[PDB]
């Protein structure tokens, strides 16, 4: 009857495409860790196979 | 007696096949997130197994 | 006395076996949605476990 | 006799299609919460499977 | 008739957008735990694959 | 009306930030095990590749 | 005529906003339990995936 | 009028904070099992990767 | 009122600490298998690296 | 006038605190079943993840 | 008054402790299947890692 | 009263021990695949380490 | 006075213990379906984890 | 009195054992999909571990 | 009575065997990625073992 479906259907989507920011931010604060270990793993990794 | 069953039975269905749009839209605003993490996951994933 | 029980008892049933049509129609206008999400869910689902 | 059925039948419906607004508003004040947790859930979720 | 629908419809929403605070707070008091284990999991995790 | 939301919202969080202790304790009583095996794994691990 | 509606309408509400206390109290005596199990669940949960 | 709300509201809570005991007891009689398997799982687990 | 909580709370636990037996038994009938393969795996494993 | 309220009010309660017995008994004859399946579930559960 | 509570309370329990039999039987006719797959899974599983 | 529990309890089990056949059949039509790859994997596997 | 209570009280019960038959029959015509899907679910289920 | 219980009790079951057909059909139109992905998953899966 | 079960049972299946297309398409847009990394992985992989 009214059909206020798509009008609010975009409104809702716009609240939550403007939410990637958080996932990227917590992203960055994953990698710093994953590098820290990874880069530290690769430190000894060569000098395992130094032999 | 009257049998206004199918006539309105389509009417009702037409209000709600015209509702996928919202589910697609909130769809798109799922994937952007899921890529963001996923693509960021695959970033470190190769360079876990860099070794 | 009169026993107009089964005669109208079928009459009533015939108004309402001719009512499945609506339930099928609103059926179809469920699945289009459920696919939309489901198929979109399966989109990212493989590429979660891409790794 | 009078048949003031549809005339007021619309009148009543118009009081209550003009009621979605509230359901949308309490809608918005659901999602902010559901994001808050959800986005915070996804925060640790990647870094469960950091490994 | 009166149509005090949206006026109180916002009033109700404002009681409950001012409720995220609790969900964030119990949020923080989830992560401290989830880090505690997670960070402690990652402690041994590298030195599983020390080999 | 009353709005005793944040006041108890902190109260609840304080019961459960004071819960990490247990997770750390069961933490310690994970690692002792994980070392035991890990350190015992590394015992033979060098003297696999003694050759 | 008299219109002693709102005057007692508040009176009634005040008997029953002063009732949250009980729901909070039985609240606390839910969580102690839910922690007990939850914290005990998380005890073995890490050391399932110790592997 | 009487307002015997909090007085019995504590009374009820005290019947059911004195109920954790059972949940801890059935707790202990979970872990013995979960260890039994877990410790037995870790038995073969090292000597899978003995190689 | 009655407070038959801990009395039956132990009763229930005693039915189910007397249940480890089964988990140990199905334990033994895991390892026989896991040895069978494992010991058979280690059979060829040395004589892969015989070279 | 008479006020035979609490006198019979206890009388009634005493008929029905002496009713837990049945609920415990049908309790026991739940768990035997729930163990039977549960313990049988845990039988194959380890040897799913035997791998 | 009569207090035919425990007398029938056992009667009811005895109908339904004599019901485990079915759950064990449908038990056996689970495992035969679960072995069939499991044992067949373990067939190829070694000879994945044959290498 | 009637106690038609075990009589049908076997009847049900017999419908579903006569169901392994399907699981074996879909079994066979797993392995043909798993061999195909596995045997093809082992083809190049030796002639990786031909050197 | 007459006390034709238990005499008809059994009569009524005998009409409706002779009613399980239907519930078993509609039982069988549940499982055939539930197997059909279940057995078909287990078809792909192994060959999800074929990997 | 009449006892038209089993006579219609079969009638009802026969409407709904003649319903598996649909569940098999929607079955087939599950697997085609599940293969499509699965077979496509196994495509890259070998050539992950090509190395 | 009507038995419009298989007639619509095919109708439903035909909406969803005509759905593989999407899963193949999102398929292709998995592999391009998986190659990209895989082929790039194999780039350095030989020249790890160049030695």
Residue numbers in the entry:
A (entry chain 9), B (entry chain 9), C (entry chain 9), D (entry chain 9), E (entry chain 9), F (entry chain 9), ...: 1 to 51
According to the publication:
Filamentous inoviruses such as MDAΦ are a genus of bacteriophages consisting of a single-stranded DNA (ssDNA) genome that is surrounded by an α-helical capsid, resulting in rod-like phage particles up to several micrometers in length but less than ten nanometers in diameter. In N. meningitidis, MDAΦ particles, after being secreted into the extracellular milieu, assemble into filament bundles that promote cohesion between cells, thus promoting the formation of biofilms. Here, we present the electron cryomicroscopy (cryo-EM) structure of native MDA inoviral bacteriophages isolated from N. meningitidis, revealing significant differences to previously solved inovirus capsid structures. Our structural data on the biomedically relevant MDA phage show that MDAΦ is a class I, C5-symmetric bacteriophage with dense MCP packing.
We estimated the helical parameters from two-dimensional class averages and employed real-space helical refinement to solve the structure of the MDAΦ MCP to 3.7 Å resolution. The resulting cryo-EM map reveals α-helical MCPs packed into a tubular arrangement, with an overall diameter of ~62 Å and a central pore with a ~20 Å diameter. MCPs are arranged with a pentameric (C5) rotational symmetry around the filament axis, with a rise of 14.1 Å and 42.3° rotation per subunit, establishing MDAΦ as a class I inovirus. Each MCP of MDAΦ adopts a bent architecture with significantly higher curvature than what has been seen in previous inovirus capsid structures, showing an angle of ~45° between the N- and the C-terminal segments of the MCP. The first six residues of the MCP are poorly resolved with smeared density in the cryo-EM map, suggesting flexibility of this region. Consistent with past structural data on inoviruses, the MCP of MDAΦ contains numerous hydrophobic residues in the central segment, which form an extensive hydrophobic network through tight packing with other MCP subunits around the filament axis. The helical parameters of the MDAΦ capsid (rise: 14.1 Å, right-handed rotation 42.3°) are markedly different from other C5-symmetric class I phages such as the Ff group of phages (fd phage rise 16.6 Å, fd phage rotation 36.4° to 37.5°) and IKe (rise 16.8 Å, rotation 38.5°), with a lower rise resulting in a comparably higher number of MCP proteins in any given capsid segment. The C-terminus of the MDAΦ MCP, which is exposed to the phage lumen, contains three lysine residues with side chains extending toward the phage genome. To ascertain how bundling is mediated at the molecular level, we inspected our atomic model of the MDAΦ MCP and noticed that the N-terminal residues 1–6 form a surface-exposed segment with a prominent hydrophobic phenylalanine residue (F3) in the poorly resolved, flexible N-terminus of the protein, which is followed by further hydrophobic residues 5–9 (sequence AAAI).
